[PDB]
Design brief:
mainly alpha; Bromodomain adjacent to zinc finger domain protein 1A
């Protein structure tokens, strides 16, 4: 495995997808299941979208990549109250994100 400019970004996305608590985040929610989601969440995003932005070389700075992941968490907590399985999973995954990002040199 070689070392490349986007290796850290790609690695973090892979680590998040593989974590058990990533299920609320893999793809955007369906408007069929959640009719009011897109009237509430102004800038929807998910791990599939973020992965593709990494693949398509769309991030110029680590801060832009980090901001997209923070947006993903922000939307989740905005729509899902603290007592939901989504928010509980999101809380753990967000900690994992901070810890793993640090290890990869992303601040």
């Amino acid at each position: 495995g070689g070392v490349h400019e986007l290796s850290a970004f790609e690695q973090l996305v892979v680590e998040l997808v593989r974590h058990d608590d990533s299920w609320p985040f893999l793809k955007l929610v369906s408007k069929i299941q959640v009719p009011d989601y897109y009237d509430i969440i102004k800038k929807p995003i998910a791990l599939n979208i973020i992965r593709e932005k990494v693949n398509k070389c769309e991030y110029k700075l680590a801060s832009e990549f980090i901001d997209d992941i923070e947006l993903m968490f922000s939307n989740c907590f905005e729509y899902n109250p603290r007592n939901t399985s989504e928010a509980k999973a999101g809380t753990r995954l967000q900690a994992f994100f901070h810890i793993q990002a640090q290890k990869l040199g992303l601040h």
